[PDB]
Symmetry: C2
Subunit: 388 residues, 2 copies
């Protein structure tokens, strides 16, 4: 029995701990008075606090569900979308068919081109909350609601936050000894270049280790192909984000001129974004980010990967643990799942910010027990959240 949504409340949660940047701060870099920093290398903006947007959604009968999306930059954007536009269209609906609610909300602004970006960030938080409600009302975990899922799967170390190439290798080794078999490094970081870095990691970790290279977008297809040729002898697991997201022609060119598996997708929003690429390019792996996408989008991307034999290896980012729990629930149902990003500093906050038995130990994620997401914000989180 599904009770109608009564209220939708939006919050930000700013954390007392901070995930390090991949790439030490350098001479010339500036902290803007507005609290943001642009990296001189990649030109991308970064926050000086970790922060996410949480949504509390409550039924008339008193069932409480939580959703979460990105809030590191301009959280008032998602907050405005939800408070001014979206909440009003969710209140009165129920959780009998969360995906139908998502589709209705998406369709409202589709023709004006708000098919991704912040609009879908907002839909993501709403969609997760609604599934959390649906699971609780059914007395079922979300993964059971979606037809069943495994209770554990492999995690890989998605980043190595140490300042030197030698230190990054020691950190990788530390995790290897603790059950991890797969690792990834960011190509722009090493002073001596990505070939030098993968060579070192391969030497340190041995032949069996899976070692991927996250190329962080900023290359022409020709340059990307060069870098990949240099890394190739060291048996890279995959090359991620070889060129700019918008440069589909470049992505096509790279993917068809190397046999190294190409992985993309953390910055997508919907299966529509995937269709645009897999129609032209040779994509081995897609890497959806729950916090940007929501459960509905996540499973549609999964289903499409299964139609084409594409591997699914979800991205992770720091948050309170709500969208991560959602990611685990949804990932567990996917036939094409081959792993899931993990970083200690990304995962650790959920220990204090969540109640629930979601865990990551010995190189594997373990799903929480219980209906819905299987988790909820802890008393600590409830004290830190601020309305927006």
């Amino acid at each position: 029995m599904n009770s109608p949504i009564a209220t939708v409340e939006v919050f930000t949660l700013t954390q007392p701990r901070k995930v390090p940047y991949l790439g030490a701060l350098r001479e010339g870099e500036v902290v803007n008075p507005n609290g943001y920093i642009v990296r001189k290398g990649n030109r991308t903006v970064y926050p000086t606090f970790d922060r996410s947007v949480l949504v509390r959604m409550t039924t008339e009968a008193g069932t409480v569900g939580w959703g979460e999306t990105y809030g590191i930059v301009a959280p008032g954007a998602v907050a405005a979308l939800i408070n001014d536009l979206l909440a009003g269209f969710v209140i009165g609906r129920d959780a009998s068919d969360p995906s139908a609610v998502y589709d209705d909300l998406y369709d409202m602004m589709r023709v004006r081109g708000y098919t991704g970006g912040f609009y879908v960030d907002a839909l993501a938080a709403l969609d997760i909350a609604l599934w959390d409600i649906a699971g609780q009302e059914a007395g079922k975990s979300i993964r059971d609601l979606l037809g069943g899922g495994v209770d554990s799967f492999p995690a890989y170390v998605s980043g190595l936050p140490e300042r030197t190439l030698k230190a990054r290798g020691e950190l990788a080794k530390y995790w290897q000894d603790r059950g991890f078999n797969a690792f990834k490094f960011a190509t722009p970081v090493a002073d001596d270049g990505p070939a030098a870095e993968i060579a070192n990691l391969r030497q340190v970790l041995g032949p069996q280790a899976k070692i991927a290279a996250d190329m962080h977008w900023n290359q022409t297809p020709e340059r990307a192909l060069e870098l990949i040729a240099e890394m190739q002898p060291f048996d890279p697991w995959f090359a991620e984000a070889p060129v700019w997201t918008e440069d589909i022609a470049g992505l096509e060119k790279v993917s068809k001129n190397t046999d190294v598996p190409i992985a993309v997708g953390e910055e997508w929003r919907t299966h529509w974004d995937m269709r645009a690429r897999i129609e032209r390019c040779r994509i081995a792996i897609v890497q959806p980010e729950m916090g940007h996408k929501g459960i509905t989008n996540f499973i549609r991307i999964g289903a499409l990967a299964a139609e084409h034999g594409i591997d699914v290896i979800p991205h992770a980012t720091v948050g309170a643990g709500i969208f991560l729990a959602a990611s685990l629930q949804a990932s567990s149902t996917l036939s094409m799942l081959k792993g899931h990003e993990f970083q200690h500093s990304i995962f650790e906050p959920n220990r204090r910010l969540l109640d629930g038995d979601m865990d990551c130990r010995e190189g594997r994620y373990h799903l929480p027990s219980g209906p819905g997401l299987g988790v909820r914000p802890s008393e600590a989180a409830l004290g830190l959240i601020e309305r927006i």
Copy 2:
């Protein structure tokens, strides 16, 4: 003619009652939702029950004041938050010596996280327009001059037939024809009797020399869109706009390659990247950039790509105070592939009092403002009405 650093960036909304009958479009017992939004059941799209846009006032340390504008009909707090919290801080201290450089820097801040369009570029658009306005004022040149020169007038086509019946819609089109307009567009969903009946009526009323385009409003499968176009084809449609869903590029390829009726798209795009994704697969005859979504930098890059491929440019127009419309006229006038420009008579006319500056449209042609920069600004009356956000 030096460039003074930006000192302040101020965001406002301007909200006003709609002055055109628009609820006549709701026939299935549609209900007003919180904050004044209403969803049309036939197309599932949300609409405001008022007119509203986001205005930006940008001022240099030396006191030059520029204005930009973007969409604000829906959740203007989104763009406002983006500007107030994030973007303003990276514009302040910069100057207008190279507005496109500032645009590229702002766009780059968030592009790898997938904020490559939507409300993010909405926000960049308002900032870009304001910066170009300042650039021109500081150089003592109109924007079009600063961009290498542009025409001072060009054809406008009529859109908006807010009459209940097919006949009255024809009569309305006739009136605008009598005023010197010779190009028109109608929305295919509007006709109870079908797009074929509508174009048939218009063609007869207006005669064979008139340009009559059909806006198909996205909601067809590619096969249904081809059928519809086939039904309209015998009446010489000027172009078929938005035959299928924006996301459905395969369907657009299919439609565009199975009809000789010119295909037009683009109002809901944000950058040349969106264009590239389409023209690389599809047969696009016309692109229809919307300045309020895009900004001048994005608009001229789209026009430049169009020139590379022999694609006509016929820009979109929409609800707004006239600030981004004026920016649209400035940028458009520099484009070799320009063939004309949408004209929303029902918005443009009553909004004259909201602007200072000589932007006009008459005798079927837009007439561009004469002054430096944008050439228009909010009137004293408009300044009385804007609210900070």
